[PDB]
Amino acid sequence: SYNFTGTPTGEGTGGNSLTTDLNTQFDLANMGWIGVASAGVWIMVPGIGLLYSGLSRKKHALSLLWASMMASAVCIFQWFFWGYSLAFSHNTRGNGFIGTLEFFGFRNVLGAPSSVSSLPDILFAVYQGMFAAVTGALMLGGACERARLFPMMVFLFLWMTIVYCPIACWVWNAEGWLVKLGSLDYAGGLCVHLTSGHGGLVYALILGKRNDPVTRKGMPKYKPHSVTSVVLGTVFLWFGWMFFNGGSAGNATIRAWYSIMSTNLAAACGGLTWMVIDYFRCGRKWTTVGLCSGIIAGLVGITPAAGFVPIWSAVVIGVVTGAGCNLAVDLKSLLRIDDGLDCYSIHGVGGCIGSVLTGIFAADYVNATAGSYISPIDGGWINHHYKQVGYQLAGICAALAWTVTVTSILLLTMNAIPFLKLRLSADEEELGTDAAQIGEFTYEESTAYIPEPIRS
Amino acid sequence: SYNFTGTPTGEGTGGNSLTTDLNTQFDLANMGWIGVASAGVWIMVPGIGLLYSGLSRKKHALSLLWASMMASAVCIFQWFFWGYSLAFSHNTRGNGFIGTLEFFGFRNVLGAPSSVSSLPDILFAVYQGMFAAVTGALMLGGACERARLFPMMVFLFLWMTIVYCPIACWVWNAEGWLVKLGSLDYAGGLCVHLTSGHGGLVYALILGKRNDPVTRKGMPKYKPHSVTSVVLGTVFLWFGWMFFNGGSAGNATIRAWYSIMSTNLAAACGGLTWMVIDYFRCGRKWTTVGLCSGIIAGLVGITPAAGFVPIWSAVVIGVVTGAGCNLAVDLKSLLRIDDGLDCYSIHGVGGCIGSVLTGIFAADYVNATAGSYISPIDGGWINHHYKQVGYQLAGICAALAWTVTVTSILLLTMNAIPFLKLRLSADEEELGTDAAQIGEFTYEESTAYIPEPIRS
């Protein structure tokens, strides 16, 4: 047999695999789960394209299902480049503000325990990358209207680098200032949904058609480009979500399965709530994207709460986030803008309803179901520890002020450069073109090239 | 460091999460597999939508693929409400006929050995919850022509409470009475396929178009609304069925993988059997829904058997089920109904053909591969325990009489209330016309409401 004669470092590379069995630090069952979960979280990336392409009331030229592969490629590459480092490095340079570049090019990402200690660096980095790929596929879907492909890549890269990563460092790193503060966030109310959501708002305001003919009064609330596309994307997203929330436990203990039950319940309820609110708000008619929008809403709602709150409380978290989001979509008719408040009214707002409600129903008797793997939490309002709701709004503010600020800067800087302008203004574009090659899901038959925006 | 000081209870909640590592009664590898097996079982719900929406010789007003997220949401919620309780509670009400309401609202559910002791309560409930949502979707597809969406919600919820859960407790509860009798049903050939399949038959005979014109002598047998929908339906369902059967072993032992192999070989032979039977019955032409209909008929046939029967017998089961089901589709041209019997000829007849054949080929040596996790079965007819076919037939008839009677009562009772009758009669309806909105998979571009039947 191959015999080892060394002890794991518990730092850096984690040890020498030639002389040290780095797997003894970890459980094979915890790894075999978070490994499968990784593959499962990724199938949410094309589910996010299928959803928001299909929900949109404007045909997009850049197919969002198609683009979601480019979102995978430049996010998987940004994560390898310096992404995993800037977020989840073992050493940070602030009050815990952003990581260093010790993990550039995935240098020394091998077998040391991560910020989740039940898992080696390389398995955590794989898992957490899909979270980035998910988020960056959302940010893509909020900013895809009349987008240009290469400035879209550059935008995504830079956005993930200077917006998602520092916020992930705050919330999920073992040394992030919001983790020390007390901000609870299971699977990314703040990191994935609040970030992508509000950059979707910051898109709507800075770019994106103002005074949009699709938002005029008396124009329908739902005119979906493809119902099928909305329903397929929810199948992938709901399925992928059991792994998104399940694996955030970091292990295979009761806590992971407790949080999948909370995840599906808050889905069912959030769905059934939206479906029905719309039934009344639309006059005894059953909406066609009503259910599916509700399902997603209740899933964003329970994202930050999944591994903290009681099962019954999920029902509450799904109903409030369903309703709150159903009403939030109506904000499209006050600004008279469409792009891309679709992403905002479900992820930005659902992210906030969730991160608060998280700090209300947060129980210690749920979190301890990870037993032996526990990183103890003080409790929430249902535990008579009342000041947790402030620790959440602290997270909600930092993650919001930073996204809303830096995304604004990023878009406007990219706008001053003609070579990188994300979206063209109508006076530049060859407006009105052979855009009949879209395309229920992607593009019409024998379409060899994507119909990109041109100028003059 | 943090330590735990208290022994698990083995009753009720099974322990105090805060003074008992509840996990120490279960293997993290067993749990992590039934956890992912859950999410896998769930992706069958829209597969059932797709497969029967697309196999239909009729445009359905209610898109089955759409209606499957609705069948997820009211089943997940019914499971949480009192579903897990009525079917799987630790104490039964007399003889082992139904469970108590001790798990109402998922009160008192976690870290306690369930009815499969290798799994806690909260995980066996998540896993088994998906089996509910799969039968909900099958009851849907059989009972959905001209169906109204809100009676259909109310119908599932009720059908799932007074038909599924009692038969579930009979066969899968530790204390159930069909367990004690000797009835073998690995993964639901009694609970899932025979019950939803026969609620299809009950639908065809009570509601659903009598003397349907699609069934006249000379009119074609197959004529699929959408072949793609059938095939992507089979893709999901087969994917799919591997966790459905594989996780029913309750553990990750050799037994799980012996039963995944039997699953795919029965599918492979159900498929080729139906496909080649159709080739000779249709005058030497390869049908478009023959292969996929045999794959599902074969997967149904092996469903009660995958964990007891030798691999080689999966061939015998796939070939006989796919044949018997092929004939059972011809039942439509004798009854002159359709509405109906697709969800019956595959699941109803398949579930029966399956469960009888489990009594004939069950082997003591195959069940035993579970190792230190076994419940030792005497075996079946090839172990010369002739008395097994009878216990299987005893299980069929118990499950068959309680479904035909209570679905008949539930459909007639509901047929008497204008607020809730599932399907409007031919005279109070108003055809068509919204077909121009259906829909290869769901609904046409920019549809906003589902074309619910309204009365004159």
Next chain:
Amino acid sequence: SYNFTGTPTGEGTGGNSLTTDLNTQFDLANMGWIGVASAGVWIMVPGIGLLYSGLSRKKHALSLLWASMMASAVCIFQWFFWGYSLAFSHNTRGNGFIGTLEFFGFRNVLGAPSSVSSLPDILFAVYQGMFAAVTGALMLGGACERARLFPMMVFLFLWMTIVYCPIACWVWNAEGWLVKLGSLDYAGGLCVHLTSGHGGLVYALILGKRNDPVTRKGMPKYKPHSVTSVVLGTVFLWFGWMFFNGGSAGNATIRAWYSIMSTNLAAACGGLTWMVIDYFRCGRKWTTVGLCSGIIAGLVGITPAAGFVPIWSAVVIGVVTGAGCNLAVDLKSLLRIDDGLDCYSIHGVGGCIGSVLTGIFAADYVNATAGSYISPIDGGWINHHYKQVGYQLAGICAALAWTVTVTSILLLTMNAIPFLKLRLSADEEELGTDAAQIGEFTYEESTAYIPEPIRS
């Protein structure tokens, strides 16, 4: 409790399961991960049907997505029949050239430790059978134009028997002659990709339409039947590939997750490389299938490498395989053949690029991360051992010589038996130009029978 009073045998059936707990030889977590990864690999089979039906510049009468359940059904069966035997028999019939038929009809495959000792036969046979079905699908892929269905079945069954199974014996069976020579092939650079690729090249030269109109000078290089098919096929494939490669570790150790991170990075870099090359070769226009084709190319290139090479080299293997496969599609316009050098230029050419570059970057310390489960390697050029590239080339030439020789003998044989002729010549064919029923994915609506070639 049930007590076990026997010891595992090591051979045949592994022991009597009635008196031995065969599970004690194996780790549940390892078995669990490779069991889920089985079903994950399966979903790659319709991905190959979706991907190559959409890439085609010719619309095919036999839908690859439809026929991919046929590839699945007859490959499962050929595995049960004698495929697992011929490839992974414990006793190879000299000198590690092909197995025996000791596992015929899956006799004795159960609990013995397989050719990967950390997994029982029955689980390793399930898992590896999916690699077969992936290959049978890729071989159906490149040989479907104007294919006849029953000859297509018989061709797959024999091609899987006398071409896939020997080569799998040589490089994967524990006693195989390329194993003991030194050839590294992690997850199927030779057995899966190089074989089916080169079988496409052999088809294209022998049966494919010579002097095809779609390849005359100035005819577009890309004219995809369906961008949506290409994108959905990549979603299933890229999801499934994480289990394809990750499960090739044979276990849940850090080597499995290290290999999944290589897999994704090479995909990402293969997609962007092709996408950017296409951009500059098609004159500043972004190709509609470029990004995806490079994703599949990169996943092909890293297939033999994933478990042996440093993460950073996945960038190199991705760019070189992306670019190399790009160039190779231009071969269609030198031979003036289309069907079916689509499969050749990604799988054939990517197999060889991948397997060579595996010998250059194999690293003893990456392989060593499986810790207690390794058979150590010297490594390749970067460990300063230069014999490894030799062993790679030896494996390439054996695999290439065999499939190019035997596929030709097999195609030319069948092509001389009127009723087994795979593809009718344009002079005996009826040429019913009813391509009107050939849909985007499968068949149009109410299509009933597949359109098989007939003769005047």
